[PDB]
């Protein structure tokens, strides 16, 4: 039935995290750059009738890599495409933002269908094939389930999202990481224009004067689990896939041009099959991506299939990310899942950019559709939850469309770790910047989230804190190294001995056990740090606290490039 | 009533304690040597001490400066005291407040003179350092201090004035102008006995050398020169003693003589006669003198003696007195009760009676003493703990160990470390092992102090591993823990824990079965050089 979307972990122009992309698409800002010189030098291929564009939306530090964390040698990762670098990153932490880790994750059926459609690297070279970049993740984590990747171009993404919907809910997988990732590394690849690139290097989407789109890239990963599943296991939920569908183009005039029947019969289909009235859906994500003719041909066919159902007008808004970060490609789909799923949490619509005119070729005064450029409050009626929906087609001709919906649900300690110091100092400053930007956070559930929804590893601090002002003053105190007695920190391999007399003594354990159920969190803390494995379970009685979306790992920012 | 002798420690010329004393004794061995230019430049014989000016200041509290400044009597007896403290199995905390009395036997001050070195301050030292309750009095009767000291010591016990006594003497011969039978050739020495009242002693567990069950003290009076002796004072003194306490002649089988080799056949006259008011008996009763051996200790003679016969009393074994050739012509042995024992032989008793022997000591200003002494007649991993001050002596005491066991195949394993838990301080420098066998336990000394690594041994500074012991001080189920463990078999865990400084209770380790603490070697004094600034 529904597909639960129980963790996400995203990095697009202009945003490292999903919480950074929030920020931007609510402040409406625009992450299109030009293309500087330490990627290449545009005014050796620049012709303004050779490449036509000399803008992206580029990714920071594409070259940074943690190896050692992911057990790679040093001297492999210059010979790994940095497109499977990066998604072994966010793939990792989106498995982190649900609370899952290693441990947990060992031996799941969990599938993994990663969007990728280029591999330039590789080609530069002269490890690198598209089978291995979705194997690394199974590889390391040791799941079970498929791992497979999806080159239809720029519905990569969302046709993945599909084959793993289909798999969850023939119960062939209990678990699926999908998602996509793009990188635009050399002049040629981007370059290839075919008419394809706008010369303002602006995707222009729904407006009269779109011209083509800019290339952006992006890395994007969703956790999605069955909604029974997700509930029982008492998971943090975005959002519910309620229906998907993919379908061909076929023959069109061109192999890259876009057929309106395609378009239409996927959407109407998917409405039909699901029971999905058009009405219901107050927003959607186009595929959006400013070309000529390729929007209004998209917005005559979503129209259409709108009309057929109802003559209620300008109820349903749209708009595309596109606008803010550009064309991410093989991530186009989870980038665009991730921002309405950001906007369902926040109860927000924000501004999709470039619109000044409406295309000429498209009339919505009488349409179900209307372009948002206001940042507002999503407006349900009733009871009723929001619903959207998001599309991506690809230049093969392979299309995707899926409809999202809102789910509606019926002193701590705090403790830390990381494979090194210093990436334990950067832990320590994500979530200081993290309580700080987020007043309301559950200090309970913080905790719980910290304790049983994170790998314990070598470096380790803990603290005591009852209030955001204590637990921001004891982050500070850590990082300032400033003495603070409710702080405590140990390198495990260095304290093994300290241990020992916990691990083998009868009285010690049953000690130790009635510390940890009479809530004695100071004794429990300075253990812990020092490596004693604590069954968490038993700080909790009657009431338990629940999983929530936390930074994830913050990866070693080492740099790897060609050899 | 009866007074038991619970603790002894002992160094004399030849002799840095009281095993090397018994094994010289029992080899016949003279100490005896030339006075080297050392010391001052050449009788030119002597019984020595080696290193007089070996201290361990810091042990005591003491800065290293003043140590110049002290009397190494002062010092010496320091030492040995508490040596004796510790031979009987008790230590600073368990000495803390006890009444306690301090009887010293000293009779010169030669070192204050070369340059605090009170008399008064010498007997104080112990006090002092232990914070002992019961007088400290410096007794000066010359020769006869130390039993003159043992005297008061059984008189204040019996009369429940204190409730332990540490007796002894100490005498040093520094310098030149302090300095067949043809006189006597000066010794060095310094001893000290541990004395409780015997139903202490016994309600209390200690391990008992010996009981005295007679003593006595006069004085010579008008002699002809104040330091000739009184043939009849001598006589009075044994008869009244004798008399008082119920002690039968014929139930003495040695007596150790003043014998300073002068006066001797003074001596043996007046003992003979009293011995011969009671019995016919002929030949029946030892004498000897271990100033054959060591020379004339001088204040110190009272307390080698004694112990001297305490360990013929434990080996069941009499030894050889020296240097006897031919009968002193003034006195005839034939017919006499007594009879010069020079052989190395078993010490007989009849029908399971205690063996019974006395020791005279006579100062040369006319006081007297003789005291009677009478045998006593008493009706799986082991966890052994050592410590120290500092490393240098917890590997010295290591040795010490190692010897005393290899030297005493039949050493008692659960006594010794039981006497190693309860009858030790627990200082700052710690090791500790198990052993199920003198092998094992040979061969852990062995391993330690060879550094060959042994996962039975466990060693640490206690100042360094503070932090590492707290989980079990405060916390009630580690406490729960820690007694389940010393409550009670691992003891690998015990150890470590111990060495590391965490306090353990040895009494947990031990149900309805309790071992005894028995005599071992005690700690083994920095030796560091001290002599005039």
Not at 52 to 70: A, Q, R, T, V
Not at 194 to 213: E, H, I, R
Not at 231 to 257: C, F, L, M, P, V
Not at 380 to 406: L, Q
């Amino acid at each position: 039935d529904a597909i639960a979307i129980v963790g996400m972990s995203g990095r697009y122009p202009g945003a490292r995290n999903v919480r950074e992309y929030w920020d931007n698409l609510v402040h409406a800002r625009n992450a299109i750059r030009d293309i500087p010189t330490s990627r290449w030098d545009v005014d050796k291929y620049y012709d303004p009738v050779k490449v036509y564009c000399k803008s992206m939306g580029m990714l920071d530090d594409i070259e940074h890599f943690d190896p050692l964390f992911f057990n790679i040698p040093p001297s492999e990762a210059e010979l790994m495409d940095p497109q499977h670098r990066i998604f072994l990153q966010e793939g990792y932490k989106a498995f982190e933002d649900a609370g899952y880790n290693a441990r947990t994750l060992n031996e799941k059926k969990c599938g993994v269908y990663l969007g990728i459609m280029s591999n330039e690297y590789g080609v530069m070279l002269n490890g690198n094939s598209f089978a291995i970049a979705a194997a690394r993740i199974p590889y390391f984590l040791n799941l079970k389930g498929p791992a497979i990747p999806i080159d239809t171009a720029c519905s990569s993404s969302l046709v993945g999202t599909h084959l793993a919907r289909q798999a969850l809910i023939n119960k062939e997988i209990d678990m699926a990481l999908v998602g996509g990732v793009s990188l635009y590394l050399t002049p040629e690849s981007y370059m290839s224009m075919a008419g394809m690139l706008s010369p303002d290097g602006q995707c222009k989407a729904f407006d009269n004067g779109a011209n083509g789109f800019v290339p952006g890239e992006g890395a994007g990963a969703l956790v999605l689990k069955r909604l029974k599943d997700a509930e029982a296991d008492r998971d943090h939920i975005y959002g519910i896939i309620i229906g998907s569908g993919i379908n061909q183009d076929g023959k069109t005039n061109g192999i890259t041009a876009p057929s309106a029947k395609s378009q239409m019969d996927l959407e109407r289909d998917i409405y039909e099959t699901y029971g999905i009235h058009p009405e219901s859906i107050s927003y959607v994500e186009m595929h959006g991506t400013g070309t000529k003719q390729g929007d209004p041909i998209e917005l005559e066919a979503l129209s259409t299939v709108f009309q057929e159902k109802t003559d209620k007008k300008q109820f349903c808004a749209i708009g595309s990310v596109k606008s803010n970060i550009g064309h991410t490609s093989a991530a186009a789909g989870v980038a665009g899942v991730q921002k309405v799923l950001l906007c369902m949490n926040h109860k927000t619509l924000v501004p999709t950019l470039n619109f000044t005119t409406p295309n000429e070729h498209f009339e919505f005064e009488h349409s179900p559709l209307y372009v948002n450029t206001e940042l507002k409050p999503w407006e349900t009626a009733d009871g009723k939850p929001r619903r959207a929906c998001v599309s991506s087609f690809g230049y093969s001709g392979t299309n995707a469309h899926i409809v999202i919906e809102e789910y509606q649900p019926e002193s701590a300690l705090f403790v830390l770790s990381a494979k090194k110091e210093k990436q334990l100092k950067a832990y320590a400053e994500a979530m200081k910047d993290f309580v700080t930007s987020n007043e309301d956070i559950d200090l309970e559930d913080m905790a719980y989230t910290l304790q049983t929804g994170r790998e314990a590893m070598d470096y380790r601090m803990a603290f005591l804190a009852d209030s955001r002002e204590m637990l921001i003053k004891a982050l500070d105190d850590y990082l300032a190294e400033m003495p603070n007695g409710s702080i405590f920190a140990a390198h495990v391999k260095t304290k093994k001995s300290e241990i020992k007399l916990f691990e083998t003594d009868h009285d010690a354990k049953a000690l130790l056990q009635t510390w940890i159920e009479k809530k004695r969190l100071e004794k429990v803390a300075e253990l812990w740090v020092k490596g004693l494995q604590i069954d968490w379970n038993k700080l909790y009685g009657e009431y338990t606290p629940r999983r929530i979306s936390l930074p994830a790992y913050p990866f070693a920012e080492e740099y790897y490039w060609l050899p």
